[PDB]
Amino acid sequence: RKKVRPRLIAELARRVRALREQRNQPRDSQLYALDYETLTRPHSGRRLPVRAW
Amino acid sequence: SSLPVSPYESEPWKYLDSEEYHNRYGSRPVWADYRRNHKGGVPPQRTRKTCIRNNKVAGNPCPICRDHKLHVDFRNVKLLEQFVCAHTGIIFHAPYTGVCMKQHKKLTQAIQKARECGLLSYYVPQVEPRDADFGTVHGAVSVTPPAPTLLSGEPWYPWYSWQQPPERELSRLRRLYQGNLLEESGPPPESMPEMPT
Amino acid sequence: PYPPLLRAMILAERQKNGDTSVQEPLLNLERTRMRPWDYPAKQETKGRAKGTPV
Amino acid sequence: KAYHGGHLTIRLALGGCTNRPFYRIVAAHNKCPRDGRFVEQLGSYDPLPNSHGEKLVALNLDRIRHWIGCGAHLSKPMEKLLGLSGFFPLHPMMITNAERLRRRRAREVLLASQKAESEAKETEAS
Amino acid sequence: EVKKPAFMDEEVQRILTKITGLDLQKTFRPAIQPLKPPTYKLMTQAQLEEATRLAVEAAKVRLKMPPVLEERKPINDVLAEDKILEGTETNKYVFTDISYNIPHRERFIVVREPSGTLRKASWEERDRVIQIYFPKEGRRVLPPVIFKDENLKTMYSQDRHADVLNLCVAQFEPDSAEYIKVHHQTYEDIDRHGKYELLRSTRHFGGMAWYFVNKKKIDGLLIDQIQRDLVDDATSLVQLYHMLHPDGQSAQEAKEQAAEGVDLIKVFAKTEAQRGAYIELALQTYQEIVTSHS
Amino acid sequence: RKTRHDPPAKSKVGRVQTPPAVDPAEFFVLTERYRQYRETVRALRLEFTLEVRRKLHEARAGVLAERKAQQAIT
Amino acid sequence: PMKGRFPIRRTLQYLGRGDVVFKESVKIMTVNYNTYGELGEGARKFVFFNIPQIQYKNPWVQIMMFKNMTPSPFLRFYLDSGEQVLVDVETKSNKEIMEHIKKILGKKEETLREEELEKQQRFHPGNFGPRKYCLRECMCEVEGQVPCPGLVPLPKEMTGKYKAALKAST
Amino acid sequence: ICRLIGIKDMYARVTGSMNMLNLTRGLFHGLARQETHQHLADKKGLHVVEFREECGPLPIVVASPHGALSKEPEPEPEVPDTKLDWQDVKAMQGLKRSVWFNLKRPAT
RNA sequence: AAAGGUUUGGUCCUGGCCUUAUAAUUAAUUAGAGGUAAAAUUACACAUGCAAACCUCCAUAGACCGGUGUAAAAUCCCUUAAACAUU
Ligand code: FES
Ligand SMILES: [K+]
Ligand SMILES: [K+]
Ligand SMILES: [Mg+2]
Ligand SMILES: [Mg+2]
Ligand SMILES: [Mg+2]
Ligand SMILES: [Mg+2]
Ligand SMILES: [Zn+2]
């Protein structure tokens, strides 16, 4: 073989993306915040099930 | 629209013993003196689909179709034998005898039906019995001791039957699912109710 | 008890192997008893939601 | 395909033609296609009654016991087949569904009797 | 109690093999099948005799008799009766264990009926499904139609009894009622028309002689063996009749007179022969021809 | 089937869950059947797990396995 | 005419006549033989006739042949344990050489039959699937079962087209 | 020609030139110089035995030496030196045949 | 291939091309219905709709199924080791 060549951009992308995750980890106050008028989580827009209202 | 009517329709085997057959065919097969008309030296691998369409006959009728008195019936064994190899017992393919595909399929069914009823002989290989041991004392083919629940008449497992829930537990569910409830169901019928008809 | 077919296969093997007995095969449920469905689960091994806003 | 995650499962693979279904009982990684790559064939199921009026199930009970012992899950249709055979206990919903059918035929019979009684009133009116 | 002789008893197999006979031309008659070009070897008289010896060894294995068994007993065992499933199914389910390394007579084949009963499969059901999943060359899933009484009579007119029996061995099990019915019908037709020669030098002769001895109708086979100058075989048949019926008047008469050879056949004629008058006439004629010519 | 990066439909934004209604007598009977059924099936799955491992050890280090190994060397 | 001398050596039937299947220990078989002489004639025939058959049944064994390196012909087998089995084939017929090596380092008939049976353990006659792997593709082929709709049309009541129409009518 | 001779079952292949005269001369040259079984028994003094697969291991004696039967077995080599035709062997080696081979043809 | 046609004044040799068999697609002309299988110009550009949810909040899933043949002689079979976003 030997025509398979390195992928520097792919390696750089994987590492670089990892750094952003570690620094920009969200917090419990943000992930689990809720809008009680609509019963929907603002961070992700997830609407709670009906049996939990 | 008037195809000829054979006198031997009821008893087809009679024709092959009549003098008319002997004069026309002698002791050779009925397909011996037939040649197919085709371009080239190698013929097509299938014969014509059929020689008779809506009471009309094709240009070069095949051995069966050209002679109307010849009848392909499982009982007419003498005719059927001409289409089976005497040495190998394999039915000849349609190109071999020049019969049309319709009659070849019809002949194959008659040959197989004659063999199934024993009118037409074929070679039966000798095969050993299926099982080396012929004992019938294993539980699979014998009597298994009846289970305790089976003798008493009870279900195999207790939860197979309907067990009325405790009254407190039914109320616990009425609180949990308050506002979205269905009419409470009692014990189901003991047997399957006979289907109304 | 064992299921009806699986019980018959056990009794058949006994007779084939020469073991003569009328004991009823029994399943033991103590080793594999299930927790309630609402039992608290292991939070340490649970996933956490990602930090990409929708 | 090169799957990542998943478990072995025993399920029914649909075969046959249109209006003529036939199933192959197989052990396969759950992420594989229904009729695609499988690990072992453990039997077959013909859901159409034959000339003798019998639906024919074939179970390789030695290999089935082997794969359940190695973590193989079971699909719900296969649990119903193992329950009818007697190799497994009857599935909870097999029992519940049979009870629902009994309660639903009980109503129909009662309605027919009421209709006959209503028809009897029509007979009384003449 | 003196054990009743069996079909596979070394003594019975010896007598049945002898009366059956061997004929390398009949045992190895050409099969009507796809043919291949023959091969040729140059052999001395020593090599040729060695080849004939191997042919006789193979003819012995080819003439191995098929088992003679008593009719199986119907399977009627109910594993369970789950009435909750009554009315939830319209057709019976048949479940077959198809594990490869289980003998077929030790496999579990159960039926879940619409009523909910889980029962063991009958003998007819067991053979049918075992053909569907372990297909045997020669056997068909559904019983063939050649075994109908009218179809069997056609085969008998053509003197195709060895085929009727070879077909009955490929299709049916030895202990099945269909197997016994067909065999007992073929053996009976051979008797009525004196066609004993059809099954000689075949694996089916032993069962035929066995059936006649047990049914006390060896008269025809003795008369035919004597008329063919096979009088050593006829005596062995009377020994087999004196072995399976020890308390019979004929067997007790031979002990009193210590009869041997042709004497045994003469004793049978007077005591237990259904048609003794003919056995003596045929036996006498054989002796006259043998003595007169030689 | 859609990928996680695909945009959601605009005809199903209004969608809200409609939980099934519960029959108290049948829900409880069914909950118990599932608990007892799954315990029986867990007892059978364990027995099958042991037959697999017993057979494996017999093949690996059974009586017959050991004799053949030494028989070959001799 | 097939080229070369004894062209039968280049037929699959001849190559399959070999009976020497080496044990798993055998890894290499070096052949030292002489091209000229009278006591090495059997060795020369063994290289000519038998070495092809041995390699055919033992594809993973390295057979390397050396010519005119020693006064006498011999065979030396190298086993996986590190043992070296020297065999002396001088004044020995090619048939004698084959039988000798079969005895000392050849698998027995019993062992080979067990492997053949084990190889086919996962083929089941009941299994349905493609012709390459299975006898029957579908249960429609079995006698007594419902036939394939393509070959034989199904009854109207067993068809989804018909059942759907009734549900609309109801 | 085979019909005129009376041969009913045979296979033949012709290659090289298709000259009709050379084929007729070549055919009669080969058919008229063949060795019957009775001749082979006399030349070697041994029995000629036939083994058909449809008759099993049954040995069939087709020709016996006219004079004195020998007692020295014919030498049977371990590996014969026969000269083989690639066309004949090619089929048995598993090589795919031509689309024109063994086609369905009318009875000859 | 069981072969055939075709160089010449003629015969023979050599040697190509073509024919006869089988199939797929498109096209011309032609045709009733029914069962079945298959569906295929283009990795060109795309209006519109739909194709992933579930669920007492957490999680899990949307990494599959489905699609195409872009790239690369890229692969097959085999050995060893370790894992899994698993059971
Ligand atoms: S191939 Fe079996 S139903 Fe069509
Ligand atoms: K040419
Ligand atoms: K067109
Ligand atoms: Mg939860
Ligand atoms: Mg078109
Ligand atoms: Mg896919
Ligand atoms: Mg490309
Ligand atoms: Zn015709």
Numbering used by the authors:
A (entry chain 0): 3 to 55
B (entry chain O): 42 to 238
C (entry chain 0): 165 to 218
D (entry chain M): 10 to 135
E (entry chain R): 63 to 356
F (entry chain U): 27 to 100
G (entry chain T): 2 to 171
H (entry chain D): 325 to 432
Please share text taken word for word from the publication where this structure appeared:
Judged by the proportion of the unfolded rRNA, the earliest intermediate pre-SSU-1 (3.2 Å resolution) is represented by partially disordered rRNA helices (h44 and h45) and two disordered linkers (h28–h44 and h44–h45). It lacks the peripheral mitoribosomal protein mS37, and instead contains the assembly factors RBFA and dimethyladenosine transferase TFB1M. The methyltransferase TFB1M binds to partially unfolded rRNA h45 that is promoted by RBFA, while the mRNA channel is blocked. TFB1M is the methyltransferase that uses S-adenosylmethionine (SAM) to dimethylate two adjacent adenosine residues, A937 and A938 (mouse numbering, equivalent to human A1583 and A1584), in the hairpin loop of h45. It has a CTD (residues 237–314), followed by a CTE (residues 315–345), forming an additional α-helix that together make a large interface of 2,077 Å2 with the rRNA h23, h24, h27 and h45. The C-terminal α-helix, which is disordered in the crystal structures, further links TFB1M from h24 to the platform rRNA h23. In the SSU body, the N-terminal helix of the mitoribosomal protein mS38 is disordered, and its mature conformation would clash with TFB1M.
